[PDB]
Amino acid sequence: QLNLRSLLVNPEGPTLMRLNSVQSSERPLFLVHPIEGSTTVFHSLASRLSIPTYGLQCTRAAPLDSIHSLAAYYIDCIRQVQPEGPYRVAGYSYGACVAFEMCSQLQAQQSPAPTHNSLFLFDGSPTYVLAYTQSYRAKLTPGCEAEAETEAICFFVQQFTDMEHNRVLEALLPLKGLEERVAAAVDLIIKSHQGLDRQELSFAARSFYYKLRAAEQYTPKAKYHGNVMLLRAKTGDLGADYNLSQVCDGKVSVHVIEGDHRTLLEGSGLESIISIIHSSLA
């Protein structure tokens, strides 16, 4: 596909970035990236929202040892613009899991006072990401980390080139460790796209593996007491609430939205989401 710079983050970029020019005292919406770590997917939404909108992007500054560490770091970044709650948080896809942990940590900090934080999940959940990682893992040799590394880096290379799965798998499988798999992957992508930045790609390939690892290993400590809204694609089985009932003990509202996983933040889907958010800020 095109705009490959949407699959890449500036590793020396800021974690928190304005995504619209709305200047007002109304509390901002913070939007958490999909797995590629960029805020690109949110530009249409942000340009249409009548409240100040920021994006959270995944730079060299982000800790990826756990979803818990990542979420704590994104809360600290948010407080550089909004020191005090309540907080409006959304996440898309991989970002849905991360935003959920941020709201849990904010709940814990204030316990037992009820927070009036708002959480929106764009087509994912703690479980939606787990389901994906468990699928890819369950077609591999168990206990064979080299095969997991190979699988992750192969998927990354396939988002930049049209190379067949098996020929990328063959090239990466016999290599000594992650850093060699990363170096081989950047050389393959550079061949297809000679002007892309080697350090951007290196950071993107390595972090892709670490992001997947953090997501597998994630389970909320306790359940989220706040009320959540899920905005899931009309065109996707994992369940109607993507298993949020298992991790929330508050009001879980599900809206089905025109489009698929990739298109629901655009076109007809985007109109519905904008109307839902704009009324839902109430």
Ligand X SMILES: CCN(CC)S(=O)(=O)c1ccc(-c2csc(Cc3ccccc3F)n2)cc1
- Residues recognised as catalytic: 93, 261
- Contacts of residues 144-152 at CB distance under 8 Å and 24 or more positions apart, as own/partner, are 146/173, 147/173, 149/177, 149/178, 149/181, 149/209, 150/181, 152/208, 152/209, 152/212
136 binds ligand X (CB under 6 A): yes
Among 144, 217, 156, smallest CA distance to 181 is for 156
Tell me, residue by residue from 103 to 132, as one string, x for binding to ligand X by CB under 6 A and - for no binding: ---------------------x---xx--x
94 binds ligand X (CB under 6 A): yes
40 binds ligand X (CB under 6 A): no
Q: How far is CA 174 from CA 2, 66, 145, 150, in A?
A: 31, 28, 12, 9
Among 41, 106, 121, 152, binds ligand X (CB under 6 A): 152
Judged by beta carbon, residue 120 or residue 209, the one nearer ligand X is 209
Q: How far is CA 87 from CA 1, 84, 108, 110, 225, in A?
A: 35, 8, 14, 13, 15
Smallest distance, ligand X to C-beta of residue 55, A: 17
48 binds ligand X (CB under 6 A): no
Which tokens hold the place of 193?
A: 């796209």
216 binds ligand X (CB under 6 A): yes
93 binds ligand X (CB under 6 A): yes
Which positions touch ligand X (CB under 6 A)? 34-35, 93-94, 124, 128-129, 132-133, 136-137, 148, 151-152, 155, 209, 212-213, 216
